[PDB]
Design a protein around this ligand. Structure first.
Ligand SMILES: CCc1cn2c3c(cc(C(=O)N[C@@H](Cc4ccccc4)[C@H](O)CNCc4cccc(OC)c4)cc13)N(C)S(=O)(=O)CC2
Length: 374
C-alpha cells in the first residue's frame, strides 16, 4: 500500500503526501534523512502552490518560540508549534508532532518542485533549536506501535519511489541486504573505508574519506566529497574518459555536457565503488555507482534535440554526503532499532547492457586503522 508513495522532479528531491492539522490540510513534503526538523510553508511564497494555515486548525498549539535552520542549500525561519499529522499513503496513524511554520525563507523553496515542506528523518541531536525538539519519526514511534525503522527506494523529469515505514518490503530489492553501522546517532553517519574509480584504488588514508563525517542524505542531490577526495576522484574520472575533453566548468558543476539524443557515451565513464564499513571487524562491502547515476539528466525542452547532463559529484567542506544520486537504484534501510543502514540492489536499479549497479561483499582489509575521522 506504501509502494510508489514518493514523487519528485530530478535534482529537486523526493516528496511524500502528508496532512497537518484538523481538519486535515494536504501538503507535499520532501523526505530528508539529512536533517531533523519537520517544517512546512506557512505563509505565501512565489514558489508555493499552497501552505499550512494554522488559523484553520483547531488542534494547532503554538510553542511560542522561533527557529532558524540553514542547510547547505537554502535556509528558512519559522515559528514552532505542534499539531496532528498523518501520512495518507504511509502507516494509517495520526500523531501529534512538532512543526516549524515557515514564515520566511531564502533559496529554500524551488520553483515548480511540487513540495511545500520538509520532513527531517534524522536524530534529535541535530534538530534546531536543540535536541529537546523531538523529531517526527521519534514521535511516530513513541505514539504508535510502528517499528523503529524505515526504508527508502528512490528511483531515477518526473521521478518516483517508495518510503516504507515500519519494515522492509522484499518486493523492492533483489539479492542480499548488506549493513553498515550507524557510527553516531545524529546524522545517519557511516564510514567509508575505500574508494575505487574503475577498479583503481584512490589510495588515501581512509580517514580522508570521512573528513569530517560521512552521511546518507536523501535531501541532498549530489555525491559530495571532501576537497582532497573530490580532486582525486575528478582526476581519475577525467583520465578514464580522456577520449573526450570537457570544459573545466562541467567538472565544477557549472556547465552542462550534451550529446545528440540517444548517443551518450556511457562506456567512457568509469564505475565508482564506495566501500562501506561492515558489521564485522575489518570487513566491508561495496556499492557501485554507474555514470547513469552521477551524470544527472537535465530536462529542458529547449535543448531536447540533445541529452544534456550535469556532473552530480561536488566538493564539500563538511564531509562526505551520499546524496540522492547515490541512493537511487538502491533499496536503503534505515534500521534505527539496530543502529545500522542496509543497502541492496533496487527493483528500479540502474544498468545498461554492459554494466549493472551492485551491492557486494564481503571484502577484507589487513590495515587495522579506524577510518572514522574522530
Ligand atoms: C534537492 C535540492 C538540492 C539541489 N542541490 C542541493 C545541494 C544541497 C541541498 C541541501 O542542503 N539539502 C538539505 C535539505 C534541503 C532539501 C531541499 C532544498 C533545500 C534543502 C539537507 O538536509 C542537507 N543535509 C545536511 C545538512 C547540512 C547543513 C545543515 C543541516 O541541518 C540539519 C543538514 C539540497 C540540494 N547541493 C549542495 S548539491 O551539491 O547536492 C547539488 C544541488
Amino acid at each position: 500500500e506504501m509502494v510508489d508513495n514518493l514523487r519528485g522532479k530530478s535534482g529537486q528531491g523526493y516528496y511524500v503526501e502528508m496532512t497537518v492539522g484538523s481538519p486535515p490540510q494536504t501538503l507535499n513534503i520532501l523526505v530528508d534523512t539529512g536533517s531533523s526538523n519537520f517544517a512546512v510553508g506557512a505563509a505565501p511564497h512565489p514558489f508555493l502552490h499552497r501552505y499550512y494555515q494554522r488559523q484553520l486548525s483547531s488542534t494547532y498549539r503554538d510553542l511560542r518560540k522561533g527557529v532558524y535552520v540553514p542547510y547547505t542549500q537554502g535556509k528558512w525561519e519559522g515559528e514552532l508549534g505542534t499539531d496532528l499529522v498523518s501520512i495518507p499513503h504511509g502507516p494509517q496513524v495520526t500523531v501529534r508532532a512538532n512543526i516549524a511554520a515557515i514564515t520566511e525563507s531564502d533559496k529554500f523553496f524551488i520553483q515548480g518542485s511540487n513540495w511545500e515542506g520538509i520532513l527531517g528523518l534524522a536524530y534529535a541531536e541535530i534538530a534546531r533549536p536543540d535536541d529537546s525538539l523531538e523529531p517526527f519519526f521519534d514521535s511516530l514511534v513513541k505514539q504508535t506501535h510502528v517499528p523503529n525503522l524505515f526504508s527508502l527506494q528512490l528511483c531515477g523529469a518526473s521521478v518516483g519511489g517508495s518510503m516504507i515505514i515500519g519494515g522492509i518490503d522484499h518486493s523492492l530489492y533483489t539479492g542480499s541486504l548488506w549493513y553498515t553501522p550507524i557510527r553516531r546517532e545524529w546524522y545517519y553517519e557511516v564510514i567509508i573505508v575505500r574508494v575505487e574509480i574503475n577498479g583503481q584504488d584512490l589510495k588515501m588514508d581512509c580517514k580522508e574519506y570521512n573528513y569530517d563525517k560521512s552521511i546518507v542524505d536523501s535531501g541532498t542531490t549530489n555525491l559530495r566529497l571532501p576537497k582532497k577526495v573530490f580532486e582525486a576522484a575528478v582526476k581519475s574520472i577525467k583520465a578514464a574518459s580522456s577520449t573526450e575533453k570537457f570544459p573545466d566548468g562541467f567538472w565544477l558543476g557549472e556547465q552542462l555536457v550534451c550529446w545528440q539524443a540517444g548517443t551518450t557515451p556511457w562506456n567512457i565513464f568509469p564505475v565508482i565503488s564506495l566501500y562501506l564499513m561492515g558489521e564485522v571487524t575489518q570487513q566491508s562491502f561495496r556499492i557501485t555507482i554507474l555514470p547513469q547515476q552521477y551524470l544527472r539528466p537535465v530536462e529542458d525542452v529547449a535543448t531536447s534535440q540533445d541529452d544534456c547532463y550535469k556532473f552530480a559529484i561536488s566538493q564539500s567542506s563538511t564531509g562526505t554526503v551520499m546524496g540522492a544520486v547515490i541512493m537511487e537504484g538502491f533499496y536503503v534501510v534505515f534500521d534505527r532499532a539496530r543502529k545500522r543502514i542496509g543497502f541492496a540492489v533496487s527493483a528500479c536499479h540502474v544498468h545498461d547492457e554492459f554494466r549493472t549497479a551492485a551491492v557486494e561483499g564481503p571484502f577484507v582489509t589487513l590495515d587495522m586503522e579506524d577510518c572514522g575521522y574522530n
